[PDB]
Design a protein around this ligand. Sequence first.
Ligand SMILES: [K+]
Ligand SMILES: [Mg+2]
Ligand SMILES: [Mg+2]
Ligand SMILES: [Mg+2]
Ligand SMILES: [Mg+2]
Ligand SMILES: [Mg+2]
Ligand SMILES: [Mg+2]
Ligand SMILES: [Mg+2]
Lengths: 176, 136, 84, 48
Amino acid sequence: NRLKEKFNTEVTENLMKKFNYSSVMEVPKIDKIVVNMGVGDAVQNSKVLDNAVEELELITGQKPLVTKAKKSIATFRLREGMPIGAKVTLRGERMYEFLDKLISVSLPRVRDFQGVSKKAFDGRGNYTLGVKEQLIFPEIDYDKVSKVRGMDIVIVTTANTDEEARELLANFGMPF
Amino acid sequence: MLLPKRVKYRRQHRPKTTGRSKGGNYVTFGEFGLQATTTSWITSRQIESARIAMTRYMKRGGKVWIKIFPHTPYTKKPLEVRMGAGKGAVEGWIAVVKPGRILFEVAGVSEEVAREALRLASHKLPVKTKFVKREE
Amino acid sequence: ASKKGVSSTKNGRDSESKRLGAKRADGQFVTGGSILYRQRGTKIYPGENVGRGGDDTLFAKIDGVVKFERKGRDKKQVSVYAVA
Amino acid sequence: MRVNVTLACTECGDRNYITTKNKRNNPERIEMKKYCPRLNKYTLHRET
RNA sequence: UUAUUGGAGGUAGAGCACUGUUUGGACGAGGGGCCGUUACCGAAUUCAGACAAACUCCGAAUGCCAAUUAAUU
RNA sequence: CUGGGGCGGUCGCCUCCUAAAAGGUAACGGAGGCGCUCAAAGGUUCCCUCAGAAUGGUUGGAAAUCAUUCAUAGAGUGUAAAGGCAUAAGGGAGCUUGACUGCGAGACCUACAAGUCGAGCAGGGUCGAAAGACGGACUUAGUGAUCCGGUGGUUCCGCAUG
RNA sequence: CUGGUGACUAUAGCAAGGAGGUCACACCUGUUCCCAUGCCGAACACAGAAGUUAAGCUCCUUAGCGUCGAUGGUAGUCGAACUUACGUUCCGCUAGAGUAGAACGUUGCCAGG
RNA sequence: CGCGGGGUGGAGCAGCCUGGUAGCUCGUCGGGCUCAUAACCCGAAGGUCGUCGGUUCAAAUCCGGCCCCCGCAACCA
RNA sequence: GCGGGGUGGAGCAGCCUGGUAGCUCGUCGGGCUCAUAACCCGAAGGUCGUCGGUUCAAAUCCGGCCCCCGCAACCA
RNA sequence: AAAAAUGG
Ligand SMILES: [K+]
Ligand SMILES: [Mg+2]
Ligand SMILES: [Mg+2]
Ligand SMILES: [Mg+2]
Ligand SMILES: [Mg+2]
Ligand SMILES: [Mg+2]
Ligand SMILES: [Mg+2]
Ligand SMILES: [Mg+2]
């Protein structure tokens, strides 16, 4: 819980001083992290979705929820109820461990890494990071990766504004 | 030629024609208007004839508003057929006009030009009319 | 004499009318089991001592006086109350 | 459902109920607990 | 039959809140010919004005069902 | 049947409008459905709430999956329409078979034959901690008299008697 | 006054601004235990009391939205008289829209203060 | 309703009688052939035998259930 | 009045049974010829008559507008 | 002893 200790000690004080919070309960915190992988080619080959689920489970540490089509779309040849994604929600210690790992061990493994988008905030204090290749994560061996596919990592925060969310993530150590 | 782009029902009961004008009894867009004083169906062809007459007299100087619209289809049987065997096919489109409704409005011209234009228009219509101004 | 060919209508169908609606009046005494109201859905709801049949028919469960009552802002119900 | 089905008590053999089933969805002889009036108890009935 | 009281219900009228129909403005989320700015602005929004047997946010007069109900019959 | 007959169309059942605010109400008037489906899409207990839009995000585009916000019903309700249903009748899960047996005060509808609703009682059950709910399905179509014959059951009869 | 739990067609709602905390209600700290997540102690469940009124919640102000809403007049209409006129007249009933205005709830029971 | 028969590579026929082995004629691919073209000759790929079961060391073959097609015959709610 | 049909340039399938546009000829390119034809190899070419509807999805299912074909149009 | 047209 090194990252959590940093948040309790340094980030809390820095952020509260910067934004003039009358109470500590106003200090933003990372509510959850949702790691999603949309596998639309599972329509054509379910083994792709199975491999994606296994890789996501290795990355995150817990079994993913398989997400199914909410509606049928002819162009995609998608029928309602067909499994076309995987999702993991991380909270608490696992969330913090994954976050520090992503900041330190994983993100620098990005090829030609030059920081993460600073404008990728929903407008209400939540940040979505699109990783373009799973090989980034240290838990995956490229030998067993039949196909390389990305992920969406949604950091959901209690910050009301992109400015506060940016300050929180920067203090945590996100490049920008 | 006005007519709805589509309707839910092409075969409709013909509208009630007794009573007074429910609405649109005041000049609201232009300065002058043509007010119906009797009741009639008004066809799209009659609307078009009156519109052309008044606009041609105004010589594009002013602006014209058609306040009525022929929403209602009416049917007619094929020639020389007996009664029964279903309702006939849509023949045309009509607006129901009762006393007091403003049929047309004009603006951007003198009162004299508006009077003459609306006179020419009224002679194309199956109702008696009167020249009206905005009230205040 | 000249006679023209006629077409046909594709219409000309209707189901039997179902005699829906109120079957007893507000303020009327009814015996238990009397149908109060025939309906589709709950246009009126069962109130006190009133049941709702499988086809939504409203009926009295006790002997008593029928009372149609407001139910909230938009709805209504029918109840039966025992007479003294 | 698209075919008629007779449910007979598997203890006394009485044909106590009729029902229906879809033959493609349930090709097998369907079974279920039903009340057997002769035995005055619930017994397993199955399609004849 | 009338008087009084209660109730069911959606017509006439009216209205546009829904489903459709429809006339003038204003403005344009955004892209194209255009350099930023003189089509389409098809969207959406918005102001005002209209139409309806199978529209209704509303809603009569009557008629109808009743009442330990009174008067006349 | 038929705005003469033939020809064409139609014939039973369900929903809406015509229908004149109870109910009913015709025409070869205006519109559509039905001759099924479901072993769960039934019962019960617990839990849940949509469609759509905006903004971020990789393969991913106007729409796939993820996140926040707004969004009161514009979604869904097997299947037409109407009436209902967001205290759900809509959605998920667990357990189940009441899609029971004998019935039935009373009531609707109605020329008859039929058709519809039904508390409650008894037997034996399912779910539920319990109250309680359950005699199919959000409701209303999905059906056809008698005679005759087939099949199963039967403390019924059995042409002198068995 | 606070809370719990009811009744009433939102006159009760929404929105905006402001105030509140040892009681209490929350957020909140955790996952050993009963219980739980199609993944997640988020939720449900349980154990607990370091911190906070930030949010919920409660209270206060208002009339922007929503809700309610006359009187008067008009449409429609039962009946009658006259009438065929896309009618007239008389009587009774009497909208919808709109206007003035009402309104930021009113109350029962119980336990605390 | 009874009795027979049929279902086999992309098409049309054997092999079922009597248990093993999937043959024949067209069709496609490659080669020889020729000035090409056809014809002809030689190499290959092509159905696991309508479907599900059953008896056997062994099933296209034997025995059942089921799905279609054909011939004749039967049919007084 | 009732039926049937409308799909590359032509003729004809595909519809019945929604997810898949086929054949012959014609056209274009390369080849063979002294050249043309024939022939061989390779390619392009139809928003399925036109508007609406149901559907996640329409040549296909449903309803109009148009065009063509066939049959019918009888008794005085 | 298969078939192989034409050329101002
Ligand atoms: K005139
Ligand atoms: Mg009206
Ligand atoms: Mg005649
Ligand atoms: Mg009625
Ligand atoms: Mg007979
Ligand atoms: Mg004997
Ligand atoms: Mg040549
Ligand atoms: Mg020569």
